[PDB]
Design a protein around this nucleic acid. Structure first.
Lengths: 46, 49
DNA sequence: GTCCTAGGACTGCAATTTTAGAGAGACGCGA
DNA sequence: TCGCGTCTCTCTAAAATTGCAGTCCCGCGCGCCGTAGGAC
RNA sequence: CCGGCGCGCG
């Protein structure tokens, strides 16, 4: 499930084989409202 | 959920506090009346307020 | 002889102590 | 040639105890005992 | 004229 690691970076190339491994191992280098309507509420109160 | 802008909070707080004061005085008065103690409601209402 | 002398009881509350929830990188097995 | 649950941690969200902090009537009277330790 | 311990009174 190592392809899930790609979402943590910008996905540079990758895809075929060993590119994902080299990139995952080299990525460590960089590290309606009614508001205000008193009349409606007065009607609802009754 | 029924009332929004402060009528939700104002009326809710008013209803809760009004009910609390009635029961708080009643419970204290009932305890003292059971022992024959006679205290005016004014003194308890000062504390409950 | 002594003369300087160096283990209650209740409540309140933040602080561990887990329990749990998800979860992923590298992977041994596998399609 | 990769794909698949998944081995081995892994880091934190969410209760679950848990070790302090705080407090626990008022006002009077009397007595005793401190003030210790050590090289002279 | 300082504090502890003990015993009391209302």
């Amino acid at each position: 499930e190592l392809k899930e690691e790609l979402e943590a970076q910008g996905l540079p190339i990758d895809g075929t084989r060993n590119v994902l491994y080299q990139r995952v191992q080299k990525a460590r280098r960089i590290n309606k409202l009614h508001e205000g309507d008193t009349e409606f509420w007065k009607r609802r109160f009754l | 959920r029924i009332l929004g802008i402060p009528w939700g909070f104002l009326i809710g707080a008013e209803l809760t506090i009004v009910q609390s004061r009635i029961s708080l005085v009643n419970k204290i008065q009932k305890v003292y009346r059971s022992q024959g103690v006679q205290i005016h409601n004014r003194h308890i209402e000062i504390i409950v307020r």
